[PDB]
């Protein structure tokens, strides 16, 4: 994109280069007017979509573009008609993350389903007009942190439980990952006699890759051993005896 | 130390001390447009990159994994209790003053005075600011780094949890600890008088409850003075939150270095794709373009690898912060120096 | 002993032993039903296997790419080019393929460090929760930890955490100290509570009201020092005898 440039080149200077070394500013050959050069694209597009199996409806979010500037930023006029619908008004919602189109803003707050960002979440929900025919549409809502609650606090008041609940919960932690080894010659040369003559110098690099992989493999066996081998003594399970009525079978 | 078989030293007094521990929870989330950085919006370029597209997908996959992890790290530390405890109209707390740490209603963002000081101390303005295409286009004269990286396809993604939501989670934890003490962390919150809760904390460290009740006025005054000293220290010392500033500086430096890497030419006649295309016909031009493409891809790969190592360090700190929140904020910890030097009573 | 560790008296477990056993059995049954009826339970373990398989698959795909070479097939270059010209093209493929292997190894090393940290946490969890009762909050599950059971899983360990959670609670008037005869009385292990006209000392975790007695409470200092002290009589067991 060509724009008038405040910066003025010295008479010997004909063009200007930025830190990246691209030509940020140029001087018009016929007229001595400095022109700034700006990349046409600004970037920033994300498509929030429910599973394609569930629906083909999509919502488009522009990170740095306000809803008014959305058509100019994506050049919607020259875009396909389907793209124009995503730049069209009536579904536009303005958020700190960016302008979101194709999603209907809802005041109600729900647990986040898909994270738009900046406290905004998008979910596929059964929003139906007239509540006579079920309709499914993407909705944009502020995420709900939790249920609001107030503790009643007094200088002379305490609450004491008169009952209890026993709860069993499951915690899953990964202990090991698959151990893998790579044949350097087979992957690069593909069993070619002509190849590997060149690889003779590169053999040292292949040895380094194998050394790292072998270290990962030995570590995985060690990780399993530390978690499960805490007691060497193998305690034989006794024929089940009364455990106080607790069932562990 | 004077050591004797029949000699012991017993303290006849005590001191209440408030100390600050700062742990990084998250790092800036960034996404890179592979074609924009390497091709610079050149139609001739990207035809060569079609084969290299698989490598670009791998770099994007690693970056997206870091971004989701950062949101998860914030969630683990601040979302320990889903129940949002509304701060009660301040009631007698035994003379203990928590108004400074409690959120201020008559201000924007509903955040504590101490939190406002911390936000001011760390400068995130240098790391990033919202830039529209119009803002960058209008301000050509000023070379802001954020516009330059945005033009090269390097962009920063906003965190899922807004600062106001993080403050609301912090206020809920604070309200639960003062009103119900340790009870809110496990099971339903049970209200307890703060002075009685403080006596339980003294019993935990092995000091008898009576000592707290007789010295309650002195204990409340010492705690209030320590909180006042902490706020004065943060306000009068610029270099307090060094670790948090370092995290923002490292992320900004990495993006800036990547923009600088574009200037380097990897054995090519010129580092500018346009100059090579202008002076060379396509078969000769392809060899020079390929050298620039391979080097630019290597620069992106190096940046992604550094980010993954940084993310692992941030993840370890976030896991420690989550453990610290559960052990010190939701409970009294007997671990030595885990929740500050001295016998831990409570943490905010 | 586990109940004593969490601060609940042993007698409460013995009187409610049948109820406690039934609640534990019901919770174990609920866990098995939840695992069977929910496909997405062990997400983390599935992710580890998926990432490793994806990394190998991407490496096979990287072979298709040509790093500035005329062809990505070594055979085509050898067939169409004499060895001096062929060497330059083969070298471009060799350097790119070596780079792809180096990138894969670097990703594996970072993944191994994450797995190592999780394995170290699992070993700590096994020693602290399975081999002992842990007083750490939320280390061995939400609520007061009683015991934990390890279950083997592919590439992972599943820990079943049995915890004590307080249930229904009631409102009761409370006082820091009792003034019996100008002397402050502080409860040794309980909290003074009032049903409304009577004062009792009870454990915080479970409601077990008991008459205030000289053995139950310790006397220190004078009534004036305590801000919330209230008037009540402390029974003496020795005086009737
Ligand atoms: C404490 O909780 C337990 C479990 O909820 C109660 O025991 C159950 O009470 C219900 C209500 O009548 C019965 O239908 C069940 O058969 C009882 N047993 C079980 C295992 O569910 C117990 O009554 C409660 N105690 C108090 C103090 O209310
Ligand atoms: C402990 O629970 C198991 C179930 O996991 C009981 O085993 C039998 O399970 C089947 C269904 O799988 C039931 O139809 C049987 O009624 C259960 N046992 C019997 C004999 O009724 C096991 O018996 C339980 N242990 C004890 C001793 O209560
Ligand atoms: C323990 O230390 C505290 C604090 O230093 C002492 O409280 C001080 O008492 C003096 C009078 O002797 C007052 O001038 C100060 O204002 C008090 N300090 C505060 C901050 O309130 C206390 O006297 C000491 N106790 C013993 C046993 O000496
Ligand atoms: C807790 O401390 C704060 C800060 O010291 C107190 O806030 C002061 O309130 C008075 C009015 O009562 C104002 O004139 C002051 O400007 C406030 N700040 C300061 C520095 O004094 C607050 O009152 C204290 N809370 C209680 C109830 O003691
Ligand atoms: C113990 O007392 C508190 C405070 O009175 C109760 O909490 C209130 O309960 C009422 C009942 O409708 C609510 O309307 C209030 O909103 C609650 N909180 C406040 C701030 O008053 C609590 O419910 C009582 N405990 C029991 C067992 O009911
Ligand atoms: C509070 O608990 C006391 C226990 O001291 C209850 O007093 C009992 O009252 C019943 C009948 O009302 C008598 O049969 C018992 O002998 C009393 N126990 C005594 C004197 O130790 C009292 O009812 C409870 N409730 C209130 C509201 O005070
Ligand atoms: C609790 O009992 C004490 C001791 O009996 C009461 O203290 C008396 O208070 C009256 C005024 O109410 C004074 O005239 C007496 O000098 C005090 N001492 C004695 C020994 O009688 C006190 O009133 C009672 N109530 C409270 C709320 O503390
Ligand atoms: C070239 O001609 C154009 C149109 O007449 C004029 O505007 C411009 O200044 C001229 N430049 C030179 C090199 O004289
Ligand atoms: C879409 O997913 C549902 C389950 O959620 C499944 O039953 C259905 O078969 C899927 N659709 C197709 C086209 O396979
Ligand atoms: C653009 O949108 C933001 C909210 O994301 C708003 O604060 C701003 O005022 C809007 N106007 C501009 C600067 O284009
Ligand atoms: C949502 O909230 C706004 C502001 O209170 C209000 O004007 C509007 O009517 C509400 N309803 C919806 C769903 O737009
Ligand atoms: C408890 O609060 C009430 C109402 O504010 C007050 O009158 C009373 O003096 C307080 N008592 C204590 C123990 O501070």
Author numbering:
A (entry chain C): 549 to 797
B (entry chain A): 699 to 1046
C (entry chain C): 898 to 1138
Publication text:
Pangolin coronaviruses (PCoV) closely related to SARS-CoV-2 have also been identified in smuggled Malayan pangolins (Manis javanica) in China’s Guangxi (GX) and Guangdong (GD) provinces. Similarly, PCoV_GX (GenBank: QIA48614.1) shares 92.3% and 86.7% amino acid sequence identity with the SARS-CoV-2 in the spike and RBD, respectively. The overall density maps were solved to 2.48 Å for the PCoV_GX spike and 2.93 Å for the RaTG13 spike (gold-standard Fourier shell correlation = 0.143). In the PCoV_GX spike, the number of RBD-contacting residues is 27 from the counter-clockwise monomer and 16 from the clockwise monomer. The LA could be well modeled into the density and liquid chromatography coupled mass spectrometry (LC-MS) confirmed the presence of LA in the purified PCoV_GX spike. Structural comparison showed a nearly identical binding mode of the LA by the PCoV_GX and SARS-CoV-2 spikes. An arginine (PCoV_GX R406 and SARS-CoV-2 R408) and a glutamine (PCoV_GX Q407 and SARS-CoV-2 Q409) provide the anchor for interacting the headgroup carboxyl of the LA. The PCoV_GX and SARS-CoV-2 RBDs bound to hACE2 with comparable affinities of 2.7 nM and 3.9 nM, respectively. Interestingly, we found that despite exhibiting the receptor-binding inactive conformation in the cryo-EM images, the PCoV_GX spike bound hACE2 with an affinity of 130 nM, comparable to the 105 nM affinity of the SARS-CoV-2 spike. The 2D classification did not show particles with bound hACE2 for the RaTG13 spike, but ~9% of the PCoV_GX particles were bound to hACE2.
